[PDB]
UniProtKB/TrEMBL annotation, chain A:
Residues 12-126 form the TniQ domain. Pfam families: TniQ. This is TniQ (Homology model). InterPro entries: TniQ. Keywords: Metal-binding, Zinc. Zn(2+) 2 binds at residues 131, 134, 149, 152. It comes from Scytonema hofmannii. The lineage of its organism: Bacteria, Bacillati, Cyanobacteriota, Cyanophyceae, Nostocales. Zn(2+) 1 binds at residues 98, 101, 120, 123.
UniProtKB/TrEMBL annotation, chain C:
It comes from Scytonema hofmannii. This is Cas12k. InterPro entries: V_Cas12k. It comes from the Bacteria.
Length: 164, 87, 601
RNA sequence: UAAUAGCGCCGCAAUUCAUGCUGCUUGCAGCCUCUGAAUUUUGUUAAAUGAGGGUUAGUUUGACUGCAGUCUUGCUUUCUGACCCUGGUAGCUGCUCACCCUGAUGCUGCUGUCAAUAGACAGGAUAGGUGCGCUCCCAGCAAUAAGGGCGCGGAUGUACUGCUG
């Protein structure tokens, strides 16, 4: 039997602005889970495999974010900060990257998917929508395991040099 | 769809250089040429429900290319709208 | 009791073209008078609350449109046809909306009331037995039981002891010892939540749309969308939803609600003819098969009999009741009045055919008119009464008509009809005082020589559904289905069931209270599918497609109507009862008829 | 060559009774010669169902009067028969395709002759697989379900059937 221990997971701390797709992706590498495995563990079923693709057509409800909060140990109000604010239209087709800031914080920021964002203000640089050398489109942010282009294997931190 | 000569004629007039095969001004000029020829047929053969699918795609593509060009460069957008007689 | 018969009308172009021009011009105030209530009218939400249109409002919107430069060219009877149709469009639509509002409330009460056994213990602060004892007291007080229990829950909250009334209601107005599975309860409570959601999605219905023949909105939208740039995705889709819309090719029919507003005659050639009030220049010739001619001769004989008798007989007993004049769609090319086909549909009360049946309608109207006059007891009201008193005296003067003794059945012999998915009908004839089944029929007997047609219907539905899919992917216009075959099979069964009822001298035919089976199944399969594909909504919809589709194709309302019509033409009473959930198709039919007999008192 | 399986129908072989068949006890006994329900089985020049697309104001199902005599109309549909075709050039128009892998409610599948090019000519609803059919299965193709791989120019502030025709 257990040596008097409370039930646990490899919890992770969220970064200052990462997207819910990227955060769930990290959580299911810190713990070795499949997307449907994490959805099953949370009790919300196949829902998680939409959110990793930014398929928020029906948006994440309060009850679904609370279910994930019970697994990932982040409250529903901090999970909501990893999604667009009410009426801020995002686009989920082109995944986009600053890359200059990815050296300061290795994450996909939610703000790069807003229809209103075209340049990163911390660095005053145009946002990328494909690998600057091989023109490949980026994988969904849950899959950013290596932090580099999947085709030509160029680090995202080096794409700082090739933009604007 | 357009004849070979008609495409070559349209890309040579909206292309900014001999290199433009498909800048946003060339792509909107080819969709505009198609839409005009398609409105002259689809208003006559009102029963042709396979051509309404073609028109509604082709108009919706033009609008996306125009909205992109509007934000990218308003001067290029204004000149393109004039040259195509759009409002 | 009513039936509709039909004939094509033939007349030289000038007459078929002049009538088309009046109907293409009349079709337009049929649209403007819907818009004058669709958006213009300020009281509209008061009508949606009451469920009924005020009896004069459409006439008060039409009266000033009679002088409109666009609408002024039409006879007084074509405006009454417009007022009729628009009255019936809203008088239907408001009555659809009111029953949906009533169902949404009538289940919103139940979703609050439906509690698990553990929730009743928490909400009462007491034992589930204390709840069983109070439920036994409530039945003792009560002894319309279900209605009384809902009243006793609305009123009489009684320190939350009405929780025991909810315990009766969820148990079907009975005591239960068993304590329920929370998974079965979760499925049950979820079905109610799904029905509430779907009723709101339905209650938010579209307003009535008129038949715009002009294409003007479509042509304006085409030249807009091709020459201009939308400012929004919503505007670009608003133009798409217009451009995809198929426009109507036929005007609304004329409705002539007064039987005398059709005048009949015999042509020199011996053919029958007709003309309409306000169109008395345009003679039309009747063309119909001899299988229906006897009514069109009767129309002219009813008219001649009144005219030969100085109006001392009333059209209150004319065999014709009302006519609907409609253009049926033709094929190929030509002007609309040369391409389409004038068809006159006559409503006929079939029991006016015979003298013994005419006497029923004489007594029915004489009682209704006597009551109306005594309920009235105004200016023009004085003339309305004189018209009613004059109908009440004239209706006693008989037309010379065919004689046939009325059918009479045994008050103890009933035909039970059981409907289902696999067996569309199955029949048990019961002598209810003997408790003896006189006969049973399964489908192979109940339409005999025609039993190949059920297998044909299932082949044709399956074959044609696949061809329609293949055709849609290619944009072919060829789109066909088994609907007329299903209509024929439902009529073969309706004749055979009533022939069997006559054979055994049955006093009545018994039909099940099936109700809204389609919506019930749709919520049951969804509450279940949500447990097997959680979060994967596309998998939930795919769960039992063939079962849900077969229930949406199940023609039970059309078979129930087909039997009603043929039974009432024969004179056999229709009765109803609860259809058993378990037993064979025969046992269902047996217990259904016996239940309807037990409900006599 | 292949199509073994699965699913839906069609009868055929049985078994069990009745809504049936002999009696009078008007409710029992008795069996399956019929007419019917239920289960199981089967694919034997058994039997029965059997969707390539089209064609007639077609015939019969009708009304009235004592089963005989009068009158009769050509409407809207479902089958069974029979016959015909398996198309022609003159414009307009949608979709699809750089090139590959997976192969979809994807397309194609008859007889004979000439070519053995991908197509003509002459027959034809027997027309890939079984008693008969399918979204199933076999064979060929697969750009015109979808996903993934990925070459060279334009564009590259999110647009990109936008190029390779």
């Amino acid at each position: 039997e257990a040596p008097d221990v409370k039930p646990w997971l490899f919890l992770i701390k969220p970064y200052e602005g990462e997207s819910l797709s990227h955060f769930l992706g990290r959580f299911r590498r810190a713990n070795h889970l499949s997307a449907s495995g994490l959805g099953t563990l949370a009790g919300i079923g196949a829902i998680v495999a939409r959110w990793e693709r930014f398929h928020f057509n029906p948006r994440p409800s309060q009850q679904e974010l609370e279910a994930i909060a019970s697994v990932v140990e982040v409250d529903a109000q901090r999970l909501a900060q990893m999604l667009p604010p009410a009426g801020v239209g995002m686009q989920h087709e082109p995944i986009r990257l600053c890359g200059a800031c990815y050296a300061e914080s290795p994450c996909h920021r939610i703000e790069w998917q807003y229809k209103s964002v075209w340049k990163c203000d911390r660095h005053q640089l145009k946002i990328l929508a494909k690998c600057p050398n091989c023109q490949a489109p980026f994988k969904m942010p849950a899959l950013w395991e290596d932090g580099c282009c999947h085709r030509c294997r160029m680090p995202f931190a080096e794409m700082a040099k090739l933009q604007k | 769809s357009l004849s070979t000569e008609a495409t070559a004629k349209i890309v040579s007039e909206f292309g900014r250089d001999a290199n433009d095969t498909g800048s946003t001004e060339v792509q909107v000029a080819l969709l505009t040429a198609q839409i005009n020829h398609l409105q002259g047929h689809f208003a006559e053969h009102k029963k042709d429900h396979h051509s309404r699918r073609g028109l509604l795609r082709m108009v919706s593509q033009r609008r996306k290319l125009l909205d992109y060009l509007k934000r990218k460069d308003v001067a290029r957008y204004t000149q393109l709208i004039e040259r195509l007689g759009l409002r | 009791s009513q039936i509709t018969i039909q004939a094509r009308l033939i007349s030289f172009e000038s007459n078929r073209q002049q009538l088309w021009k009046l109907m293409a011009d009349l079709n337009t105030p049929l649209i403007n008078e819907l818009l004058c209530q669709l958006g213009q009218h300020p009281d509209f939400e008061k009508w949606q609350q009451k469920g009924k249109l005020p009896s004069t409002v459409v006439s008060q919107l039409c009266q000033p449109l009679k002088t409109d430069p666009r609408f002024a060219g039409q006879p007084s009877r074509l405006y009454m046809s417009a007022i009729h149709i628009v009255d019936y469009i809203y008088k239907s639509w408001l009555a659809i909306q009111k029953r949906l509002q009533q169902q949404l409330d009538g289940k919103t009460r139940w979703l609050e009331m439906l509690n698990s056994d553990a929730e009743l213990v928490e909400l009462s602060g007491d034992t589930l037995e204390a709840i069983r004892v109070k439920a036994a007291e409530i039945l003792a007080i009560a002894m319309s039981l279900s209605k009384t229990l809902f009243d006793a829950y609305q009123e009489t909250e009684d320190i939350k002891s009405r929780s025991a009334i909810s315990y009766l209601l969820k148990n079907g107005c009975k005591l239960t010892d068993k304590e329920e599975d929370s998974e079965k309860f979760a499925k049950r409570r979820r079905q109610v939540e799904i029905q509430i959601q779907r009723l709101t999605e339905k209650l938010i219905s579209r307003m009535p749309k008129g038949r715009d023949l002009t294409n003007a909105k479509w042509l304006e939208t085409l030249l807009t969308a091709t020459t201009t740039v939308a400012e929004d995705n919503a505007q670009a889709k608003r133009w798409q939803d217009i451009l995809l819309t198929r426009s109507s090719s036929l005007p609304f029919p004329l409705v002539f609600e007064t039987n005398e507003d059709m005048v009949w005659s015999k042509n020199q050639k011996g053919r029958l003819c007709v003309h309409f009030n306000g169109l008395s220049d345009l003679i039309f010739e009747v063309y119909c098969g001899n299988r229906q001619l006897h009514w069109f001769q009767r129309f002219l004989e009813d008219q001649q009999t009144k005219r030969k008798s100085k109006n001392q007989h009333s059209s209150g007993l004319f065999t014709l009741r009302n006519g609907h004049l409609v253009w049926l769609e033709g094929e190929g090319k030509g002007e609309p009045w040369n391409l389409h086909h004038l068809t006159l549909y006559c409503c006929v009360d079939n029991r006016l055919w015979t003298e013994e049946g005419t006497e029923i309608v004489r007594q029915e109207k004489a009682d209704e008119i006597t009551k109306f006059i005594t309920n009235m007891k105004s200016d023009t009201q004085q003339a309305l009464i004189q018209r009613k008193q004059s109908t009440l005296t004239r209706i006693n003067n008989s037309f010379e008509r065919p004689s046939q003794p009325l059918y009479q059945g045994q008050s103890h012999i009933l035909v039970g009809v059981s409907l289902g998915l696999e067996k569309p009908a199955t029949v048990a004839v019961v002598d209810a005082i003997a408790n003896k089944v006189l006969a049973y029929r399964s489908i192979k007997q109940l339409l005999g020589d025609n039993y190949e047609l059920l297998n044909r219907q299932r082949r044709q539905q399956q074959y044609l559904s696949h061809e329609r899919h293949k055709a849609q992917k290619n944009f072919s216009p060829n789109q066909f289905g088994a609907s007329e075959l299903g209509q024929h099979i439902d009529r073969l069964l309706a004749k055979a069931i009533v022939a069997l009822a006559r054979t055994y001298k049955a006093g009545s035919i018994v039909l099940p209270k099936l109700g809204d089976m389609r919506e019930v199944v749709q919520s049951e399969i969804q509450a279940i599918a949500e447990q097997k594909f959680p979060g994967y909504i596309e998998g939930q919809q795919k769960y039992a497609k063939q079962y849900r589709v077969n229930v949406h194709r199940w023609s039970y309302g059309r078979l129930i109507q087909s039997i009603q019509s043929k039974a009432a033409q024969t004179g056999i009473v229709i009765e109803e009862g609860k259809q058993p959930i378990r037993g064979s198709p025969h046992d269902k039919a047996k217990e259904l008829a016996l239940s309807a007999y037990n409900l006599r008192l």
